[PDB]
Amino acid sequence: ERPTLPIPDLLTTDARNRIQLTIGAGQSTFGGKTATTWGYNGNLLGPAVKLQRGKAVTVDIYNQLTEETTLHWHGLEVPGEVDGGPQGIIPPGGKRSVTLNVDQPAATCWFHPHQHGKTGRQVAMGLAGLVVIEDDEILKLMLPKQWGIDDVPVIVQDKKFSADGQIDYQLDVMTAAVGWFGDTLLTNGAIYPQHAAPRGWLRLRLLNGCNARSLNFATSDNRPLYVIASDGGLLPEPVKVSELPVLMGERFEVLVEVNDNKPFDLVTLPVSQMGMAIAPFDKPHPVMRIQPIAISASGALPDTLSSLPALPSLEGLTVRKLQLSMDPMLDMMGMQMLMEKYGDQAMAGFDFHHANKINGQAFDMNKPMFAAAKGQYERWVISGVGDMMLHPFHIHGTQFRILSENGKPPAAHRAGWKDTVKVEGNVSEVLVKFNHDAPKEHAYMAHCHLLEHEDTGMMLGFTV
């Protein structure tokens, strides 16, 4: 509760409607020990790219690594050609430009690499940034809006380090099964930082940027969170909660009341997921310390945020079934290594590189599974019947509606605009529409956002 919370620079267009992102390596320090890290416009993580609905921007992307990478805009409704999936290679030393014509509601999205079979490693190395989409609707609401004062991004990620201090990442049979997770928790790159927040309302834009660890946010003194937005933007009205589960890649925006001068913690609560309840995550774990201060803020919590469209009628819509599966050998072999390495705490609460799949096929980049309709709602049925793993299933090129999440209607705060849906040993249904095109050369991806599962096959391509 000591270093101040790092705040990503809010990056806007220049006079020529361009934005420069440089992808480079550098050095970060975690707990006294230095580590090689990757970042956008810096050594670690990245900026918050600010975009206005209905305004085009060109982004110039400079790969200053010595290996290939891609830049995917997670949550953005844009054509496949700029979507930055594994076919959007930026060679080392190379420069690629993309045009983003933003046409979707205000939201906190994010961007990260999407290299073929290396997404987990590139994100673990430090690469992630934010996208703040604004529109006319949101600025009329009088929410907390002072960036890095009462409107603050909170990117929570776990990492594991070697004895030398270097990030200890590996795509092996255990991580291919259960995911890459660590024992150290970072908040905008820092360990248990403090943020100084004005009395009144504090707005937190939460991002679970872990490779595989699911989270569950609360406060130390159990004051509520007022959920105001999901992956794809504002909810119709606030949802007041005591805790907030957040899957890998999901974003929620919450308001928290800063009503006295007593400091408290934003925390994450222990979750039931293979590997994730191992100490120190067997108990509530602090994310950041919040320190009330008496400086000016005028943000507020409205009664009503937005009006969303109704769910479409289901009659006549195309149904697409996506069956997620793991090779049994991976499951057991991965489970053995987990039990070997950690023991009984691990469950508290044959090429493995193509062992994870959808409709019995490990991802093949030259063969898109189908062409989805443009401008027409479809019903996608995603089943995890057959294993007990957690699958936060993400679909590019869209913000959808969850019709059913793992056997029930979605929770109220998950019933708005989402690009991620929980699949865990059951079936989920989403109502999805694609407003933009994606040819086979720049196909959209649908995949599990437990990145090691993605990297080892749990992904498909599709065209629109």
Task: Please report whether residue 285 would count as binding Cu ion according to CB under 5 A.
Answer: no
Answer for which of 198, 396, 453, 459 binds Cu ion (CB under 5 A) is 453
User: Can you tell me whether residue 321 is helix, strand or coil?
Assistant: strand
Q: Shortest gap between Cβ of 211 and Cu ion (angstroms)?
A: 11
**176 vs 218, beta carbon nearer Cu ion:** 176
On whether 112 is known to bind a ligand per the annotation, the reply is: yes
User: Can you tell me whether residue 400 is helix, strand or coil?
Assistant: strand
- For Cu ion (CB under 5 A), the number of binding residues is 4
- Residues 113, 115, 120, CA angle at the centre, nearest 5°? 70
Q: Alpha-carbon torsion 361, 363, 364, 370, what sign?
A: positive
On whether 396 is known to bind a ligand per the annotation, the reply is: yes
Q: Shortest gap between Cβ of 371 and Cu ion (angstroms)?
A: 24
Cα–Cα nearest to 217, from 286, 134, 167, 121:
286
Q: Shortest gap between Cβ of 369 and Cu ion (angstroms)?
A: 17
Q: Shortest gap between Cβ of 37 and Cu ion (angstroms)?
A: 26
| Sequence-separated (6 or more) residues with CB below 8 Å from residue 4 | 193, 194, 195, 196
**108 vs 211, beta carbon nearer Cu ion:** 211
On whether 285 is known to bind a ligand per the annotation, the reply is: no
Task: Please report whether residue 433 would count as binding Cu ion according to CB under 5 A.
Answer: no
Beta strands in 311-364, from DSSP E residues, in sequence order: 319-326, 356-358
DSSP, residue by residue, 91-127: -TT-EEEEEEE--S-SEEEEEE---TTTHHHHHHTT-
* Cβ contact 395:322 at 8 Å: no
Question: Site residues for Cu ion, window 339-398 (CB under 5 A)?
Answer: 391
**188 vs 211, beta carbon nearer Cu ion:** 211
Task: Please report whether residue 450 would count as binding Cu ion according to CB under 5 A.
Answer: yes
On whether 354 is known to bind a ligand per the annotation, the reply is: no
Answer for which of 178, 369, 382, 448 binds Cu ion (CB under 5 A) is 448
- Residues 92, 98, 99, CA angle at the centre, nearest 5°? 170
* Cβ contact 197:147 at 8 Å: no
Q: Shortest gap between Cβ of 419 and Cu ion (angstroms)?
A: 16
Which residue lies nearest Cu ion, judged by its C-beta? 448
Q: Alpha-carbon torsion 449, 90, 9, 46, what sign?
A: positive
Q: Shortest gap between Cβ of 380 and Cu ion (angstroms)?
A: 16
Which segments are annotated as binding site for Cu cation?
A: 72, 74, 112, 114, 391, 394, 396, 447-449, 453
Residues that bind Cu ion (CB under 5 A): 391, 448, 450, 453
Binding residues: 72, 74, 112, 114, 391, 394, 396, 447-449, 453
